[PDB]
Amino acid sequence: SLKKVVIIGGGAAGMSAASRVKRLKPEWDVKVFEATEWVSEVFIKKRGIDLHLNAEVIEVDTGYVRVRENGGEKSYEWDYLVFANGASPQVPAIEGVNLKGVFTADLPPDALAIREYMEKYKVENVVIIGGGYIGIEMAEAFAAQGKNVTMIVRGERVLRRSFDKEVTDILEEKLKKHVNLRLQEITMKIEGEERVEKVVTDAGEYKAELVILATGIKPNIELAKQLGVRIGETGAIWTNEKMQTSVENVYAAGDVAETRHVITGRRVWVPLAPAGNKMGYVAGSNIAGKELHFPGVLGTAVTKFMDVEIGKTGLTEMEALKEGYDVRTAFIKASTRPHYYPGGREIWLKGVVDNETNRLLGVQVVGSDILPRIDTAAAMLMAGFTTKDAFFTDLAYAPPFAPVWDPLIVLARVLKEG
Amino acid sequence: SLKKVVIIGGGAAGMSAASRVKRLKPEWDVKVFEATEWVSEVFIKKRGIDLHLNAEVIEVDTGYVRVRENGGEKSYEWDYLVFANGASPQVPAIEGVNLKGVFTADLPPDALAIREYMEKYKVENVVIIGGGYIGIEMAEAFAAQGKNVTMIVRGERVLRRSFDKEVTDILEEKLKKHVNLRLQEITMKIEGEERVEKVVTDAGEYKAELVILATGIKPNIELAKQLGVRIGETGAIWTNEKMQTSVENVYAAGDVAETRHVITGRRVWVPLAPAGNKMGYVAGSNIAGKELHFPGVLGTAVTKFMDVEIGKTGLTEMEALKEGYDVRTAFIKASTRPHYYPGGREIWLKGVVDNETNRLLGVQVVGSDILPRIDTAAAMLMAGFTTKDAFFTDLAYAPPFAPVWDPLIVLARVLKEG
């Protein structure tokens, strides 16, 4: 039999879904509609997937969808539909945010655009509004180009809601030495003639010939609300372990979807590509008739500013307390190598533990050589490891790799004894 | 009450034990007896531990120990004993093992000594005997010295018993380009006038000013055998979860102690530093009246030759088949970064799986940026994760740290669909 499967996405989740259902059902007609020029060369045609780029979906209803591609407007039939249209920038409500000066760090075109622009009309000073992940990277990006950079965050510190203050402090310390960090400020508007000229906030004004808004992202749910799909308390599309929505045969994965936290169990929205990919993977499995449950996410994340790396996995102390846990914590400094081997950098680990179960609730790591600590910790968290379980986990050691007591085991010892 | 703890060791396992019994029971008399001049700097004297360097133990019995220190003998009483006397190099029974230019990489003076003989007597050609970790790490050394190196291994390939062939081949590939690798050759003679001149093997002869005997390590169970302590089927001291031996109130930890494999349950001998420190830690805790259990080890190992790192955790395909397991494996190649991002190096992963439980039995990794994978896999293995559990672990992602699908998740995926 045939079965028409239609995917409104094209990004990480859309294509993972597409590929899984195609490989499981070669005889089925799987299509992907990307409202854009990007994916992940349409090699996919050979893969057996009918990709349509710059094909925008403008109406959807049960069994069908209407897309406008190449001026034309055609409508397609579907048995199984998958919402995989990710998230989009959320523009702030400040005066004039559309002048030739402003740019948002999103789709690769902007990367071509924004960059090209600068590498044209000479741009010296550049201001970034946002103390989030995106903000920080763009900051690093520009400083590296020698351009003077200035960050504006309304909160008391950057990454204000993603990490606790003790991890952030190490980052801010380094950050302040390459970018002009302006906290507690609220932008109030941004004047100029044909191009952005100056940015003004309730504390001062700043020279600016390029501006980046890293003020936020929102799930692209409009098309789904049209199908009457239930959207979660988080603002993203409600979903179950199979990536199923409240409407029959309608799945949703990636940045549009709201998933569940593996630790707290409540619903969350963690728009990160690794999970998105798997979300699309199980959506496609279930569509093709093979049961597969997605456990949920840990909220794992990582980024960096120049050489100081920062990462988390699991609950933060803010989150853990917010959730009503009785927690004990620990914050330790350690080294990336034995204190003799050359190249040993510094590494800081924050640990949050459930005092009642001695269960590790979350770990935050900043400094150097973070990836090993957070990935191991994520596995531990995924398994419900206690402070004791982590201490006795047989991790690797060699002078060029790490110290006899891995920074993760140290934190564990310190939590256990507390 | 007064309890007299005596530790025959001084090494990692030894000090952990002392440091633990001492913290938990400040009032007890804890004495460590090192035959040598090194440990882990009597800051340990302030911790309350009565450390005795150059205090070689020569006899032991139910009530006392007879150590030979400072010309004369002395006997100390003990209510609790701990064998933490580690392991010694095992020399081949061949001609002139003691020519002035021959060494074994063990006790700290060896480093100073070897580097002295090399940094004094002009040394050009250095010969290494054995294809172990010690052999390979030593090659990387003299090779980086500009010195010419020739390695002799009697087996068909290096790390013949520790890693599967497809993993070691990558290593040998880099190895054959900086060292003269001589496989399947049994060393027979090492000759020279007063100092080593050459080495002769059943396949030829090589010239050497300095030779490294990295052919094996062996548990120092002699003083324990004297006390009737049951020694394991592996050759090292038998032990239980609390690091107790067959003799009452006698514990053992470190390279002398035989532990158990977490995945297999069989008794194994895995002389590594992290495990040792923990064995010693639980030995103490238990002597002090605090029940603690060491779960055993995974066999986690890591090492590297120049820029090609090689590691593992859990069973090897050889071991798995050896244990009667129904296995399916997978070997994949991947990038350490997104394949667009600059800096991406190659990384290889071999995974073993129980075809009946779908539980991961082991992971061997080779190439670049190894640590994050084998450490994460260690935790997964430590928890009894299936191919599917591993697939869904929330690992971190950002272009500077890793690709969207971590190579560990890629392996899981390939194993799962396997």
Swiss-Prot record, chains A, B:
Keyword Nuclease: no
SUPFAM superfamilies the UniProt entry points to: FAD/NAD(P)-binding domain, FAD/NAD-linked reductases, dimerisation (C-terminal) domain
Thermal dependence summary for this entry: Optimum temperature is 85 degrees Celsius. Thermostable.
Pfam families named among the record's database cross-references: Pyr_redox_2 (PF07992), Pyr_redox_dim (PF02852)
Protein's job: Catalyzes the NAD(P)H-dependent reduction of polysulfide, CoA-polysulfides, and CoA persulfide, as well as the reduction of a range of other small persulfides, including TNB and glutathione persulfides. The likely in vivo substrates are di-, poly-, and persulfide derivatives of coenzyme A, although polysulfide itself is also efficiently reduced. Shows coenzyme A disulfide reductase (CoADR) activity with both NADH and NADPH, with a preference for NADPH. May also play a role in the reduction of elemental sulfur.
Sequence similarity: Belongs to the class-III pyridine nucleotide-disulfide oxidoreductase family.
Source domain of life: Archaea
Transmembrane segments: none
GO molecular function terms listed in the Swiss-Prot or TrEMBL record: CoA-disulfide reductase (NADPH) activity; flavin adenine dinucleotide binding; NADP binding; protein disulfide isomerase activity
Enzyme class, broadest EC rank: oxidoreductase
UniProt protein name: NAD(P)H coenzyme A polysulfide/persulfide reductase
PANTHER family on file: NAD(P)H SULFUR OXIDOREDUCTASE (COA-DEPENDENT) (PTHR43429:SF1), PYRIDINE NUCLEOTIDE-DISULFIDE OXIDOREDUCTASE DOMAIN-CONTAINING (PTHR43429)
Textual note on the cofactor: Binds 1 FAD per subunit.
Cofactor(s) this protein requires: FAD
Catalytic activity annotation: NADP(+) + 2 CoA = CoA-disulfide + NADPH + H(+); NAD(+) + 2 CoA = CoA-disulfide + NADH + H(+)
InterPro entries named in the record: CoA_disulphide_reductase, FAD-bd_OxRdtase, FAD/NAD-bd_sf, FAD/NAD-binding_dom, FAD/NAD-linked_Rdtase_dimer_sf, Pyr_nucl-diS_OxRdtase_dimer
UniProt free text on domains: When compared to homologous enzymes known to reduce CoA disulfide, this enzyme shows a narrower access channel for CoA substrates, which suggests that this restriction might be responsible for the enzyme's poor activity toward the bulky CoA disulfide substrate. The substrate channel was widened by making four mutations along the channel wall (Y65A, Y66A, P67G, and H367G), leading to a fourfold increase in kcat for the NAD(P)H-dependent reduction of CoA disulfide and enhanced activity toward the substrate at lower temperatures.
Enzyme Commission (EC) number: 1.8.1.-, 1.8.1.14
Keywords, sorted A to Z: FAD, Flavoprotein, NAD, NADP, Oxidoreductase, Redox-active center
Binding site for CoA: R23, R47, N277, K333, W405, R413
Residues noted as binding FAD in the record, renumbered to the chain: A12, A13, E34, A35, V57, D255, A273, Y397
Complex and partners: Homodimer. Homotetramer.
